From Swiss-Prot:
It comes from Escherichia coli (strain K12). The keyword DNA-binding applies. It is found in: Cytoplasm. The keyword DNA-binding applies. Keywords: Activator, Cytoplasm, DNA-binding, Transcription, Transcription regulation. This is Regulatory protein SoxS. One of its GO terms (biological process) is regulation of DNA-templated transcription. The gene is soxS. Residues 25-46, 73-96 bind DNA. Induction: By paraquat.
Length: 107
DNA sequence: TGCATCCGTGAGTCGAGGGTAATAAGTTCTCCGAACAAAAAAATTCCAGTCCCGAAGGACTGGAAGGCTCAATCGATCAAATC
């Protein structure tokens, strides 16, 4: 099996258990690889970060789960990768130049 | 015209048990023919013997293709704090 098939399955791996408390080290058990072999191969194809990749969409899916539902932000930290809200809001201001609170108020 | 003659008829099945018996010659003499014999094929059963893409199979050569340790240094995790 060539390597361009695996990252097609690696992105067919991730988007189904984002509401789960998921990490990179369980991907390496499911893909059988080591913990380090995931992060070299993503740069030949995407030229982005795969360590922050599973952390990017826990903003992007909390950009619709907070947006559609009436969920408050202090349960997003304990499940979607963090421990407190003071770090979750900072990753948003580097990505899309916004704060989480005034992200919904903009119709 | 009888009178005298004769042909052609008569319920249906189960059965229950099988078929007799009379007297009747001899001689030689001789071709028509049998099955056993006893060969003479011809037909099969047997037995090794050369050919040929495959025949269980090993190896080879060849490009491809592979797993996970570290370490300067990035970025962000953690956790007191703080508007």
């Amino acid at each position: 099996m060539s390597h361009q098939k695996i990252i097609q399955d690696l992105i067919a791996w991730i988007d189904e258990h984002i509401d789960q408390p998921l990490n990179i080290d369980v991907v390496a058990k499911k893909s059988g690889y080591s913990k380090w072999y995931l992060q070299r191969m993503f740069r030949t194809v995407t030229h982005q970060t795969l360590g922050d990749y599973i952390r990017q969409r826990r903003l992007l899916l909390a950009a619709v789960e907070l947006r559609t539902t009436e969920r408050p932000i202090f349960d997003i930290a304990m499940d979607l990768g963090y421990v407190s809200q003071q770090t979750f809001s900072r990753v948003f201001r580097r990505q899309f130049d916004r704060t989480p609170s005034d992200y919904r108020h903009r119709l």
